[PDB]
Design a protein around this ligand. Structure first.
Ligand SMILES: CC(C)c1ccc(NC(=O)[C@@H]2CCCN2C(=O)[C@H](CCCC[NH3+])NC(=O)C(F)(F)F)cc1
Ligand SMILES: [Ca+2]
Length: 240
């Protein structure tokens, strides 16, 4: 997250860190959202490489013991049937990970609230992006979970020429674009939390930024619109 601030430990309890095994250690690659005790939602581009993955829930500082972490293996990956690695701009950047065990819920580990199917946010709706990604374009990962206020930019403005044009589809949410705050590499797969009827719900899965940089004026961070995939999510949970 570029232009963020450090989050409190208990503010975003559905946030997970998706890590892969690197030698004898584990490295953070992507965010995700816990949606059932044994299911995580993330971006399909995060699991394109056939690596050994684990999920950490109750995480706050990547590099030091918080006393709240639970570490569980990924047992099954289900990416959307229409995902194409060679075209993230086509959409369908979403995958569901079945965990090897059920995690225990407590004040650090809670399920993410999903929107109702078809829900579209009005322009400039208040949302927060959270993650441990790069704090600058071509920078380094955050040690502690970061958050930034990222108001939505509706489809009509975001698909205009001055912004993303044709690259953004209606199956996506755009948020930010002020040149200061944005998602950045390592935030992918994580939540865009938006306040709807007094409740924060996860309306976006972070998908991409400009190849020119993370915080680029009129290139908002783009998210998979979760409310476009509610039937698919439920059909995968109910059969696996
Ligand atoms: C035009 C469309 C196909 C397109 C639009 C933007 C990009 N973005 C990029 O190439 C930038 C710089 C490196 C990582 N990156 C990205 O945007 C990658 C996901 C893209 C996967 C591409 N196969 N995601 C992120 O960095 C983020 F911010 F979500 F955490 C790539 C392609
Ligand atoms: Ca830790």
């Amino acid at each position: 997250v570029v232009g963020g601030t450090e989050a409190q430990r208990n503010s975003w309890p559905s946030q997970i860190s998706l890590q892969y095994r690197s030698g004898s250690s584990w490295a953070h690659t992507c965010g995700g959202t816990l949606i059932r005790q044994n299911w995580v939602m993330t971006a399909a581009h995060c699991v394109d490489r056939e690596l050994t993955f684990r999920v950490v829930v109750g995480e706050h500082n990547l590099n030091q013991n918080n006393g709240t972490e639970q570490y569980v293996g990924v047992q099954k990956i289900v990416v959307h049937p229409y995902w194409n690695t060679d075209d993230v701009a086509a959409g369908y950047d979403i995958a569901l990970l079945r965990l090897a065990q059920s995690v225990t819920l407590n004040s650090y580990v809670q399920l993410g609230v999903l929107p109702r199917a078809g829900t579209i946010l009005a322009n400039n709706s208040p949302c927060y992006i959270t993650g441990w990604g790069l704090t600058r374009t071509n920078g380094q990962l955050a040690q502690t979970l970061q958050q930034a206020y990222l108001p939505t930019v509706d489809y009509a403005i975001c698909s205009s020429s001055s912004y993303w044009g044709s690259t953004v589809k209606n199956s996506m949410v755009c948020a930010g674009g002020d040149g200061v705050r944005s998602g950045c590499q390592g935030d992918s797969g994580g939540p865009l939390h938006c306040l709807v009827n007094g409740q924060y719900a996860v309306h976006g899965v972070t998908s991409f930024v400009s190849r020119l940089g993370c915080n680029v004026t009129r290139k908002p961070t783009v998210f998979t619109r979760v409310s476009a995939y509610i039937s698919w999510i439920n059909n995968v949970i109910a059969s696996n």
